[model samples]
Target: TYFTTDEHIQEAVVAAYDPLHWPDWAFDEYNPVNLMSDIMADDLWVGGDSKTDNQPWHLMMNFEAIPTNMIYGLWKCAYSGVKRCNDVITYLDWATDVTDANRAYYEAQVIALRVFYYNWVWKFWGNVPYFDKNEQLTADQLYEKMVTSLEEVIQLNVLPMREDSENYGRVTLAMVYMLYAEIVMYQNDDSRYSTALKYMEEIISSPQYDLMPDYTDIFKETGEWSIESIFEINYKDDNAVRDWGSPLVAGGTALPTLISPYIWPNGTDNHDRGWGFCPVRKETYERYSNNDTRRNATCWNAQAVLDAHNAEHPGDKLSYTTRYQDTGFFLEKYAAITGNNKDQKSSSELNWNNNLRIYRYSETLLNAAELITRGAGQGDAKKYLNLVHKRAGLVTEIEPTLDNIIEERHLEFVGEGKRYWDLIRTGKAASVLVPDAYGYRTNSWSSSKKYLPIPQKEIDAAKGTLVQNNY
Candidate 1:
């Protein structure tokens, strides 16, 4: 009844890509990663209309409560995504009309997506149950199984690199290498550092990817699927019309609606209005040097922009005040821009089609730089680090020390949701995250609470099999 033909197999493979939508989750709500990781970190403030609004996010910013819904929802979505991948693997051999080469390619892509989803699960909730075509494994077993599975996929070497522009969003060998490198690094196994470096080197030498000259272009609609993009979650703006109903069509993305600011000043039509969230911190803004081009690219001062706007329009003075935590800075990277909401047939702002760049070439260079400095990898560490640094108009070349790599990474990926993990990975979270002037604390800073609390529902579902992370 299932994959009796090539078309059926291909259709299922396409359907497997649906899980990528789970990254941002619903069109109108916050996903666990975007909410907990970014808001909990010092880089972002839970900005909305007021302190009372989006209170859960504010509580989360202060590490006050463990949101059970977020935990349960994320866990459900992840395993459901795994099912799609497993189905592809389950039915691949049964498709009578499918060729061996096509089947291999489809299997590799689905496996890579499965690994990618599992990696996120591992990162967010350390001890997740692992599954494949076979039976499921416990948390510890899952970790080892994942490590072995990643290594196996790497050896297959069937996926192509991103040399052809046509292969913009498709999973490729480069993506597998990057994913493999990340999983090993996250495990914190020093013996595997060299193995991680091997994959990072392959991406660096692939000649298929490079950093875009302008840092901001990497986030723009024009720059979608550019050379800098290694793995991008594709979203269709026009094709998938958002029907004014409870469930949104599969093809549209919710990023633009979730991250955009609330009502804007009348004159400024630069970005459309939506729920204000992920407000950038002033300290993060000040961290950038005046000459650094990335500072403006990563964050924008709304008060300053409105001030300039009001200066020009003497007739109409607009009051643009900071709403919730009022940091004055808004995220520039993924916030909904002007024209993003245009040409929409439906009323749902969730239809905005901006693609999320999951992995970029710039990160590859930095990852290599970090590994090389740690006594692994085959390239000059400073050279790789300097490429990103100098592109930001930074002149002095900092030595590729661990501290320098961490600092560079902080600047490189401010609003892109990488800061929290970087701090946690390097053991700098405890040192750097203190109560700010507004009384934001790390709350319960301990080895146990570093990873989130596993959903109680999962614990119940697992019966005695799963153990909750100590808070």
Candidate 2:
């Protein structure tokens, strides 16, 4: 209520963006959602000093997460955004300097952001895990709710086609469309596919965004809000520190450091070491051909990088402290590049300036292609599909089949947290996600383990006020 001044109100809006960084650090838990999803999938492993390093992630990699220890940070993180948005909405009109135009536009961003936050909650919390036979709400009921809200955002049409550098982190109509396509497709609702694809095609048709031809440059600082990025969660290296559950929202994130190799030798000079979690599996690195430049950006191949360093300068001795699940492959997309940890105020290795890329233009094309394959009204789906494929330095043309689209996305979005869902949405989770060659994951995914049981602490806090998801 005190944020009645225009300047103060805008700061209140910033609070809504704070929760977006939570999943990166996982609030107080080590279960970052991308690692949680990727490790459970085949592309990455729950890498640390030992299998028991992050035990919850170990249970997850094996599809054995019980009700007692599951990822509950995301639950709290999503609701935090919801509450922040609700507060902003309630107090918006009180700001005297905010004109009708600014008010409407701000409302559009806030609402879409709320929807975006709710998107994570619904897809992860309330989706088939709860939305299936679990029976939280009718399928149509929830899908309609999301679709209609996004439609209103589209109707308002206040968001721009792209956010300028000054506003690189805000929501946009492209993001709204991506969010729409995501929710609609995740539910497998054919009724909305036509419109979803239409929205996606609109993005592809626009010159505002394009695929970054070189995949390697897309993860760099220059690529954060490049022509390829639609939406990204912006993090900073300023002293704005976020202690565990602290109200400090404006700071760097832990992702780059968390996934970085622990005690990293000066493989490439001027880099920082990390906790060595979520090492990319060797097979994931091998999935791309040597000709495909995408491989360079997907997995680091840290061991080779170290050897290259030695060959370049034999006088400078360098080595890395090997940890468990030593795939020799670390995530390059969010790897700890130089100056990442140089300015984190926390100093405890909890922050870095690695902005999380949420939605990108390349994904828009793939989503459109997949929707076309699902009979969602065609519009050069093959062209859209091949745009990313050819950009990866591959000469071969990729057909717009579901198989090609799935394979393309898996290759393109390896460490970016898209593979596990791709497998689930295509109904191949049970078979394709079976035991690996190394035999680390003995158990496989099934309908029963589709979602980890809600954390036991949540159930206890509710204390019969709510029911547990009996998975």
Candidate 3:
């Protein structure tokens, strides 16, 4: 009865998905990639109550992170996923009742899931210890081997093109393809772009996906697993029992609570309070034109909302405090919309239903365009690029240039944690990620900033198993 049944094995597979949600929680500290990556990029500020509110982020944003001021949550969260996935693989043999088809699917899912987890470990902390092999290899060789593992799993061709609503967040064909392209691009592996492009174009050609018609609607609960999404890490509110003391319990994300503005006086709108970090930069707001639907959708004006709240209340005089780096703008992509978590049985701050939209069809279009521009293959690059451009409500059609495609990704995926990585992979981080005249980020991005130094605590605890990174 222990692990002999296929049903029990299936349950174990589900548990492996748990740590994907942990980056959104604030265990030792906040580690949501949306904030972690966007803060480093020029689009968002590490805004909190003060400069050192999340001092590690201040170090990270300015590329001043030491082992002490670096991220611990993302590091721990990823390895947790890796361990869980390994658990599934190890015990799979004990499930003698698992059918051939079920076993194949289970293996495929865990394989992809393992890659997804290790990708964070591989991407952010490149010099970490390997579990199985003790062979010492450079990060590039290790990354290539990581890419090879995904390639072999992809060869299985076992993932569904799209999972129906009941299977909403499971690993799928498009998700794997997206990760394939992502890893290849991050490595700047020029040889693999053609292969990755082939996979992305296959996704584009599939009838299962398309760009969601309206840009704003994609962020709503109604859009959780819509056709546009490749893989959205699932969260919920109904029946959610997650509270501050029991963060490891299954429920919604603490992310909305973390990034949302604080001191929001009770208003007609049902917006809840938040700690007010990762405020959208004013410069980023100006990057979008007025007519672009994405502009208002991406950046929320707190003052404007306050005016409406004050007007509705008449004499109540409700106002929100402008936290550090108060650009009068906040990230609207996943702000604490009170209705989204109203049904939670536990603490309201802990149970938001905002599904992290990890991969989307729009990126498929952009990836194909980018691969083609970089001499990957021949296809309708302009058509793929313009599909996203037109969908953003921009009347002007953009030519399929690398600059244009990259900028469109910048505009499209703001606060989604794509921009900073985009700058790094494209080899322009040094030039564009330079210090701002505002003096907030006095240090320019350097090659060393790409990989964070191994946390001193981790190095100390590794018992000589871990070698501290030079950065």
Candidate 4:
């Protein structure tokens, strides 16, 4: 059907925003979440263990890069979603019978969404073509256009103060501001972290967002579809179900079934089905101060603490904690203590109501804080940073320094998708993700593994139209 009418286009606009509408493999099984979380999980999982060699867990462990099998489906879907938004924007502007205000809103929403896609793309690929115009462009033309720069994308999309109540998430025009802000943050050769201050100021000043009173509330079921979420991968219980499980919570969800702690005791049945993947790293935990709530929220002392807690609260129907070997902590982010893992019928039941948060109010705060520190001074930056830290009980106050900001970032946003990117954008990725004394390392740009080799299948399917990442 033609998405030309006001109602029709809004429906399409809504459709474009629902990430869960993509296939299960798009978000889980084969997902970039694996790239972001697995590495962080390995780093976060205390003392990477033998079980760390598997899916999600292995991503952070500096395993040999296997280009043929690495997940590119999410990237494919991001472009596909962009194509949908492009269609909406094109139709609304040219189509009659759609009101002027309605057309503006649709145009704004699609533009904003496109900016979001490019925001991640810029970080992941380092250098990518901007499809902001969303018009007729060949693959080669597209590639050529995107190769050199992502100049001031955020600036182009920055909405005025008035546009927010109307254009809020739709596009006018804070999104463009975020895009440029991120670009500058990731590549500040000029020491112009000062450039980001205005963009951060725009988003922070908008009344559209605020920190969730409780940090856990951001992850819990209570906060779904709330104002705090700038944008998230929306999933619904029965009405809207995507087939994939989240790779982020795999330790609590799929890992137990796939690896060692097989819930099924019989040889035929996998007992506590957990290979104990994504164990917490010692260094990451050390970053948190004593009262930091994230430490417990992200990992659990698998062997000891689970036993004591379950044993003490015997009525709580659990046998899974026995799986943790000794001091190892299992992932608590998605661990199901009250729910039955089996007979749940599908992946959706495992996380019936819990939606994965991709962008939220806190990240905005972190972005604002980082911008402030870089531009104004440590004093003002700490003000925003402390807001997130206080919510997590990580730090009520902190002296502004890059390390302190990094530490606060680690404490506040760990286990979520921001850490690795945060490191890369801030240029601290070399120290953290790259191997120094530790063997675990990632494919950096200088190495063969820097940008992931273009998927061979896609290359084969391209029929020689598209070249490999290096090509």
The TM-scores, one per candidate, come to 0.93, 0.92, 0.96, 0.73
Write candidate 1's Cα lDDT for 1-471 as tens digits: 768787888888877777666545543444635555778677888777765575656665665546363334455566767888898888875677788778788888888888877876777777767778743354456667777877776667778877465656677888887887776666676788887887777787877788888887888888888888888777766656654353325655666666566676522748665677777888889999999988887787777876787889988776554467667677777767776656666654666667777788878989899988888756788899999999888888899899998899889987676777787778887777667777655464456556676766667877778777665
Task: Compose the digit string of candidate 2's lDDT tens values, residues 1-471.
Answer: 578777777887877787877776665675455676788788888878888887878887898887676777777777677778777777775676788777778778777877777676565545422221003443356566667878888998688988776887888888899988888887787888999998997898799899888888898877878889988888777675766665346677778777888898633655668888888888888788888998878888888878888899899868887788888888888888887656666644666777888888889989998998989895887898888999999989978889999999888888776787788878988988898778789987887675567677766776665455444
The per-residue C-alpha lDDT of model 4 at residue 265 equals 27
For candidate 3, lDDT tens digit of each residue in 174-275? 899999999899899998999999999899889889988999999988988888989888888988988767777779988888877888753335566688
Report model 2's TM-score to 2 decimal places.
0.92
* Model 2 stretches astray by more than 4 angstroms: 1-7, 93-98, 127-141, 238-247, 267-270, 309-317
lDDT ranking from best to worst? 3, 2, 1, 4
- 1 or 2, greater by TM-score: 1
Clashes of each: 0, 0, 0, 35
TM-score of 3: 0.96
Task: Itemize residue pairs with steric clashes in candidate 1.
Answer: none
* Candidate 2 lDDT score at position 254: 74
Distance from true position, residue 185, model 3, in Å?
0.7
Error of 4 at 380 (Å): 1.7
Give the lowest summed-lDDT range of ten residues in model 2.
127-136
Return whichever of 1 and 2 wins on lDDT.
Answer: 2
The top-ranked prediction according to TM-score is 3
